[PDB]
């Protein structure tokens with residue numbers, strides 16, 4: 111029993127964190143095979159013009175108490191790739207994957223190439239993450255684990271004025287309409303990840319919380335009309351299909367659970383809580399719920 | 409900016425998780441140097457869990473009855489001893505991944521990270537607090553016994569908890585790494601119940617200072633309170649008494665924000681009376697009590 115916001119074990123990623131210093135700026139890098147990946151802002155910026163002036167020896171890379179020697183450098187979108195002379199002996203089996211809004215991942219927050227904490231979070235529909243980052247956290251990475259393979263999906267680049275965070279995939283493409291420059295940028299109006307709230311309601315049912323259940327069902331169209339009124343993301347047939355296993359395990363049809371969600375949106379919780387929360391939680395995917403309520407290991 | 413429930417990086421602990429099997433029972437063990445620590449109930453039988461005599465069950469065992477597996481490698485048990493509710497299995501190999509470590513016993517209100525494991529394999533990491541009733545609100549399934557709680561301040565791992573059982577309310581009970589239970593619990597299937605739980609007041613205050621640090625001030629008021637009047641009000645909402653030690657501990661946060669502890673106490677009294685009125689504090693509609701004053705300083709400053 112119990113339901114916690116759970117991150118993946120971070121050990122495979124900890125063995126990849128390095129410190130990258132260029133001039134006065136120090137941030138984190140990801141050392142995989144013989145390449146160190148880091149945000150290109152470590153160097154109104156013209157990154158090609160700034161990079162052409164830098165030599166390999168201008169980049170100081172430190173893995174623990176060992177200085178790695180940079181033998182090449184190149185830029186791919188907003189990520190800088192520093193070729194080093196040594197392949198990381200701790201390089202795990204990995205992939206670079208780009209995620210969709212609503213998908214969750216673990217973040218290993220780092221400062222000076224040293225991991226300080228690990229937390230779980232979701233890519234918001236407005237492409238920001240509600241992270242916990244201070245100055246020097248740039249280059250910290252987001253990941254998931256599938257059996258023994260680490261899928262890297264995020265690299266931290268910046269904080270927006272509202273306290274939320276923006277970054278890229280490991281190929282340097284930003285999530286959202288953001289640019290790596292000190293300029294006026296703002297996160298768009300955010301929405302609630304509907305499929306994730308439903309997954310969390312199924313997690314509460316599996317954990318013995320049933321007060322919000324009712325005899326009613328609804329249509330996909332009727333529910334989307336309601337969800338649009340409360341700034342909730344539209345629920346698709348794909349989402350309904352994905353929730354199938356949880357619907358079969360609890361005996362509560364996905365549209366039956368939608369009628370519970372509609373009643374909670376129109377009437378509130380009335381002093382009650384669900385899994386120790388007075389708000390509807392949207393940072394657990396249907397897969398996260400199945401993984402935690404079944405105990406999958408890595 | 410931001411405030412998340414943050415766990416310590418688990419890598420140093422992952423390299424210590426092993427699987428311990430005795431008979432038909434399999435659970436997790438903690439391999440440090442040449443010793444594997446695990447709950448002693450791994451030696452129990454299905455028919456003897458109400459009143460097990462662990463000394464009598466252990467005397468009948470030999471080293472080869474304990475199967476210890478570290479990854480795909482079987483470790484050889486060369487000795488065994490019991491210390492309170494923990495079984496210590498001496499093995500013929502020191503763990504090359506043994507980090508710098510200490511065994512620490514924590515007090516209620518203290519937080520730690522949990523590396524939940526099944527069959528010696530880590531499945532997840534989450535943040536926890538030792539409740540005032542000495543239970544933890546964890547997320548554990550059958551076979552999670554032996555999973556450990558820890559803090560990693562600097563490069564040293566301080567092991568503070570080992571999971572032993574789930575009580576009927578869905579909460580969890582366990583021991584320190586010396587085998588002493590937290591709370592009035594025993595490792596028997598006899599009727600046991602967690603005592604009435606209360607809110608960790610010093611932690612809620614720490615989290616209110618964290619909200620002030622991140623720019624949230626809506627909940628502050630022009631009032632103050634004596635410590636005794638605050639405690640008279642707090643007890644009515646099932647909040648733990650706030651001691652002078654707690655007031656002293658909150659001193660640094662008070663100096664950083666410019667809000668006296670007893671003024672923050674008056675803001676908490678008002679929140680307990682009024683609720684949040686559709687508002688949130690650090691993205692939460694409830695008053696959070698699983699961040700200590702130390703956690704707030706570490707996450708907000710470094």
Ligand SMILES: O=C(N[C@@H](C(=O)Nc1cncc2ccccc12)c1cccc(Cl)c1)[C@@H]1CC[C@H](C(=O)N2CCCC2)O1
Pocket residue numbers: 111433449450451452453454548549550551552553572573574575580594595596597
């Ligand atoms: O409940 C069991 N074990 C313990 C326990 O509480 N385990 C668990 C921990 N966390 C979460 C859990 C969620 C769901 C089910 C179990 C959970 C337990 C019970 C009572 C006293 C002690 Cl010290 C330990 C079952 C039934 C007996 C079997 C067991 O441990 N055996 C030893 C020898 C013969 C089999 O496993």
Ligand SMILES: [Cl-]
Pocket residue numbers: 513514515518
């Ligand atoms: Cl303590």
